[model samples]
Target: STARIMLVDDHPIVREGYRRLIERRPGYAVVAEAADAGEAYRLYRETTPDIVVMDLTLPGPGGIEATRHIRQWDGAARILIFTMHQGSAFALKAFEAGASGYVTKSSDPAELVQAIEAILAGRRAMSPDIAQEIAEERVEG
Candidate 1:
């Protein structure tokens, strides 16, 4: 089944770029788009897209808070962090906020596709680079 995608980014160009990239891949469609957390929540409820590609840095409450809100309402929300923040800290925080997939904007388009596909398959997806970094930093409990 084609995955319905919702884009949440403040920049128009960024949103358009993501829209084109995702739509170019088979089985994905940009069903809705929003520029802020409030708008995102409104559109999310209205559209309920299967996958949401959201920017971590935003104007108001930021993506972290927005993600938390979304997760509170729907535990199954599939949020992929599509942002410029490439550091592992932001990625980890995104996961804690209930993101199913996390991909840095610096990642190759194919990696982005893989992340989305992985989440669609009902699994968590993280860039291998970030994953390795996270693992390396973890101290055995």
Candidate 2:
């Protein structure tokens, strides 16, 4: 019943921290980690993790592309965007690409866990900081 997790980040060090943070929760297990969009998509197809914590600023292609690639294979795949970019445009693009959640780097680790839980629970989730920007985007859209 536990969720198997996949982590996508360009930096191995950051992925290490995320693995520690996510594994701290009792019911979640990190099944794979990818350093770029290509590897992310490849590992995703192979491992089929329950959720993906994706970094938008990968060295190539980026997480948005990875998100699209994973969803193209499995529409029900759950992906949570984890990145330093907080622009409303980026957030909107990720959702359009099929990400289920988006959390900024400045947010606390506890909230990151909460985002993953919410997404796996079949809910759309976002960090509080970007909610306002997302709303503003709606006004302009």
Candidate 3:
């Protein structure tokens, strides 16, 4: 079965890029798109997609808080933080807020696909760069 995905990004171009990338991949389809955290959360309930591809720097409350709210309502929701933020802090906050994965926008488009697949497969999906940063932070702090 094809996995339904919801895209949440402030930029239409970013959303469009991801939409194209996801549609080209087998077993994946984007069901909804939101430009802000409020719409993202609302559409999440309306669509109940298999996965959510979200950007952290949204116009409102932001993706982190939106992710937390979603998790609170649906513990089984799978979310991937796909954003421009590459720091370990953003990734860490996302995980704590219940995101299943983290991938920066700077990553290859293939990496975005990989992260979504990983999350849907019940595995933690983290970009190598972000993962390394988190690891180093753990060791240092």
Candidate 4:
């Protein structure tokens, strides 16, 4: 929880929710916040946060493209997608798209910060079900 984080969500209120939860604790701090996918790239390069916790639904491009974009700019940039879609584990392309972590909003809010912690420590952050399927893939075809 000592990482510098960036949050990407078009709604200031949503960002405030995340901030209220995460920033409320301490150690983990949001250094930059972006509204659109394009701005995400710029602020990412500019501020160089330790972690990026972004929403899937953006007012602009999307978290998918933005996740890919950030990875393109700096392969080491750690990103966690905070989504309501639970559509993945349903293919989970965002994992392939280079997001290091994924946490649905429906999950226990405790999971969110821990996902960030896992990403910060160089772990692949995801639900157990997704992790199981991915694990199955690595050992097979």
lDDT of 4 by residue, 7-109 (tens): 9998899788887788765798888888889889999999999999888888877888899999998999898988876644533778788988878787778
| Residues 77-110 of candidate 2: C-alpha lDDT, one tens digit per residue | 9999998999888998999999999899898768
Show model 1 residue runs off by greater than 4 Å: 139-141
Residue clash pairs of candidate 3: none
Query: Least lDDT summed over 10 consecutive residues: which range in candidate 2?
Result: 132-141
The global Cα lDDT (0 to 1) of model 4 is 0.82
Clashes of each: 0, 0, 0, 0
The window of 10 residues in a row where model 1 has the poorest summed lDDT is: 132-141
- Which whole-number lDDT from 0 to 100 does residue 104 have in model 4? 79
Candidates in order, TM-scores: namely 0.93, 0.94, 0.95, 0.86
User: What lDDT tens digits, residue by residue, belong to model 1 across residues 23-137?
Assistant: 8888898999899899998889889889888888898988889999998998989988887776678888888889987787777778887888889999999887788768877
Candidate 3 overall lDDT versus native: 0.89
Give the winner by lDDT: 1 or 4.
Answer: 1
Which pairs of residues clash in candidate 2, taking residues 3 or more apart in a chain or in different chains?
Answer: none
Model 3 misses residue 21 by how many Å?
0.6
Best by TM-score: 3
Candidate 4 backbone clash number: 0
On TM-score, the stronger of 1 and 4 is 1
Clashes of 1: 0
| Predicted candidate 3 versus true structure: per-residue lDDT over 34-92, tens digit per residue | 99989988999999999999888888888899999999999988999898888898888
lDDT of each: 0.86, 0.89, 0.89, 0.82
